[PDB]
Design a protein around this motif. Structure first.
Motif, short mmCIF file in Angstrom:
data_model
loop_
_atom_site.label_atom_id
_atom_site.label_comp_id
_atom_site.label_asym_id
_atom_site.label_seq_id
_atom_site.Cartn_x
_atom_site.Cartn_y
_atom_site.Cartn_z
N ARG A 34 -40.82 -11.12 -13.44
CA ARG A 34 -41.32 -12.44 -13.08
C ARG A 34 -42.79 -12.37 -12.69
NH1 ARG A 34 -37.96 -16.81 -12.13
NH2 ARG A 34 -35.71 -16.39 -12.38
N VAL A 35 -43.60 -13.25 -13.27
CA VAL A 35 -45.04 -13.24 -13.01
C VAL A 35 -45.33 -13.88 -11.66
CG1 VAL A 35 -45.74 -13.16 -15.42
CG2 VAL A 35 -45.22 -15.36 -14.36
N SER A 36 -46.46 -13.52 -11.07
CA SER A 36 -46.90 -14.05 -9.79
C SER A 36 -48.29 -14.66 -9.95
CB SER A 36 -46.93 -12.96 -8.72
OG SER A 36 -47.02 -13.52 -7.42
N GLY A 37 -48.47 -15.85 -9.37
CA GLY A 37 -49.74 -16.54 -9.46
C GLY A 37 -49.63 -17.91 -10.08
N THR A 57 -57.08 -23.87 -13.29
CA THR A 57 -56.40 -23.44 -14.52
C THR A 57 -56.54 -21.93 -14.62
OG1 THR A 57 -57.07 -25.54 -15.55
CG2 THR A 57 -56.15 -23.84 -16.98
N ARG A 58 -55.40 -21.23 -14.62
CA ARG A 58 -55.38 -19.78 -14.59
C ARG A 58 -54.94 -19.23 -15.94
NH1 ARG A 58 -54.79 -15.74 -10.37
NH2 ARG A 58 -54.65 -17.41 -8.81
#
Length: 58
Positions: A34-37, A57-58
């Motif tokens: 699972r990604v973080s951020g 916007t990342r």
RNA sequence: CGAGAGGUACUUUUCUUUUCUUUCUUCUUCGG
């Protein structure tokens, strides 16, 4: 047996609350890792910080 | 007590005279 016994209604809420608290969102091309951020906390020092926090916007 | 986030924190860090040339078209030198 009624239909409101096998369908667990808390398994979606306890997953959404954990994803909103820990920040670990689901990967778009995977199941684990699972990604973080994705989610973040708001800054309340001035109204410009919460305005630019809704404009990222990342 | 460990993890996740955001924040302070490398600032110019090595350019060399700033006086550098346009007043141009000017006798080749020796001996029969």
């Amino acid at each position: 047996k009624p239909i409101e016994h096998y369908l667990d209604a808390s398994v979606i809420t306890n997953g959404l609350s954990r994803a909103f608290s820990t920040g670990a969102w689901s990967h778009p091309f995977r199941k684990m890792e699972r990604v973080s951020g994705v989610v973040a906390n708001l800054g309340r020092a001035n109204p410009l910080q919460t305005l630019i926090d809704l404009r990222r916007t990342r």
